[PDB]
Design a protein around this ligand. Structure first.
Ligand SMILES: CC1=C(/C=C/C(C)=C/C=C/C(C)=C/C=O)C(C)(C)CCC1
Ligand SMILES: CCCCCCCCCCCCCCCC
Ligand SMILES: CCCCCCCCCCCCCCCC
Ligand SMILES: CCCCCCCCCCCCCCCC
Ligand SMILES: CCCCCCCCCCCCCCCC
Ligand SMILES: CCCCCCCCCCCCCCCC
Ligand SMILES: CCCCCCCCCCCCCCCC
Ligand SMILES: CCCCCCCCCCCC
Ligand SMILES: CCCCCCCCC
Ligand SMILES: CCCCCCCCC
Ligand SMILES: CCCCCCCCC
Ligand SMILES: CCCCCCCCC
Ligand SMILES: [Ca+2]
Ligand SMILES: [Cl-]
Ligand SMILES: [Cl-]
Ligand SMILES: [Cl-]
Ligand code: NA
Length: 241
């Protein structure tokens, strides 16, 4: 794999996992310190949700860096390297990111349940695909997961967007800016997976880990930076509970 075997354990991708760990930690601490001076009840909710996104990713990236939760999956004569913590991270952080968007939109808890449920199914079926032992199974689960993703993104771009519009220009503009990022950045994930080690195997583990790290840092720290600097986070919220 393209990279550098930092820990001397035969894993050049740890260069990228190490860089990712550091960036997630810096982002977490930045949001934490910024949050300490926040008093508004709504803004505190966005900070709490959003700090946890690179916070949990920090733990996942540190895990992966040290090789905790790394195993191999037999696919014919190949043994594909899978990091469980990548999927565990996404299982927690994608619902949190969607909750941020749902708070902005001020949508109801059944809408939120639908959104986060389909998102969880996306991650679970991606993991099933990653652990599957035939190409046909891996591609089939990938396709199912990708349909789940399209459903999530469609809901964001239609139902939640229309709800956010009613909340006035500040909230609408922030919702729209973040949704623009999400529709593009999230779609990059299935593309990378299917061209990478899990799918067609065009891209190797090194470049793939690098690019997932960039996507993860952008979709977490980048997203969070854009959200938390907006006046929209002062607007009234209704948590699902
Ligand atoms: C559709 C699809 C995927 C989507 C993952 C996504 C959209 C992850 C987003 C991550 C973020 C934003 C976390 C930080 C997989 C599981 C890679 C592969 C199977 C198909
Ligand atoms: C009042 C909000 C209603 C939200 C929509 C409820 C019906 C949606 C059913 C499930 C749709 C996702 C399919 C799961 C597989 C992609
Ligand atoms: C054990 C297969 C479960 C089938 C249930 C339907 C799930 C949705 C379609 C995706 C199933 C992929 C199976 C791939 C087998 C080669
Ligand atoms: C030959 C083994 C079965 C292949 C299953 C792959 C299909 C998985 C995706 C689900 C089917 C598409 C449904 C379209 C509705 C949006
Ligand atoms: C209003 C449309 C909602 C559904 C959108 C789902 C798919 C997102 C399309 C964006 C594709 C980005 C490709 C980037 C390639 C690097
Ligand atoms: C001998 C070791 C070579 C190390 C080369 C490192 C390349 C540059 C590091 C930055 C990687 C991309 C960072 C993306 C930030 C989201
Ligand atoms: C204004 C002070 C900046 C401190 C921010 C710390 C976060 C650093 C992590 C890198 C995040 C890059 C996101 C990429 C956005 C496209
Ligand atoms: C609204 C109910 C979900 C619709 C999903 C449409 C996917 C677009 C392709
Ligand atoms: C603990 C994280 C390891 C960081 C490696 C150095 C990256 C520049
Ligand atoms: C021999 C150790 C190489 C360390 C590379 C550092 C990458 C800069 C972010
Ligand atoms: C203290 C803020 C970050 C919390 C992250 C939770 C996961 C770390 C194990
Ligand atoms: C919650 C942090 C997970 C990573 C711990 C590293 C353990 C040392 C090898
Ligand atoms: Ca307020
Ligand atoms: Cl405040
Ligand atoms: Cl208040
Ligand atoms: Cl590679
Ligand atoms: Na290493």
């Amino acid at each position: 794999q393209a990279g550098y075997d930092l820990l001397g354990d035969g894993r050049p991708e740890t260069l990228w996992l190490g860089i990712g760990t550091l960036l997630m930690l810096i982002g977490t601490f930045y949001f934490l310190v910024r949050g300490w001076g926040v008093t508004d009840k709504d803004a505190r909710e966005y900070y709490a949700v959003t700090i946890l996104v690179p916070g949990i990713a920090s733990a996942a990236y540190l895990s992966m860096f040290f090789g905790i939760g790394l195993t191999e999956v037999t696919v014919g004569g190949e043994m594909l390297d899978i990091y469980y913590a990548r999927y565990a991270d996404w299982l927690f952080t994608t619902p949190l990111l969607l909750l941020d968007l749902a708070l902005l939109a001020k949508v109801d808890r059944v809408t939120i349940g639908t959104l986060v449920g389909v998102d969880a199914l996306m991650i679970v079926t991606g993991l099933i695909g990653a652990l599957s032992h035939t190409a046909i199974a891996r591609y089939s689960w990938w396709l199912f997961s990708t349909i789940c993703m399209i459903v999530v993104l469609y809901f964001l771009a239609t139902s939640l967007r229309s709800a956010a519009k009613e909340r006035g220009p500040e909230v609408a503009s922030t919702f729209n800016t973040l949704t623009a990022l999400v529709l593009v950045l999230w779609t990059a994930y299935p593309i990378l997976w299917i061209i990478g080690t899990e799918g067609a195997g065009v891209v190797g583990l090194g470049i793939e880990t690098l690019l997932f790290m960039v996507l993860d840092v952008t979709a977490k720290v980048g997203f969070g930076f854009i959200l938390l600097r907006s006046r929209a986070i002062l607007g009234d919220t209704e948590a699902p509970e």
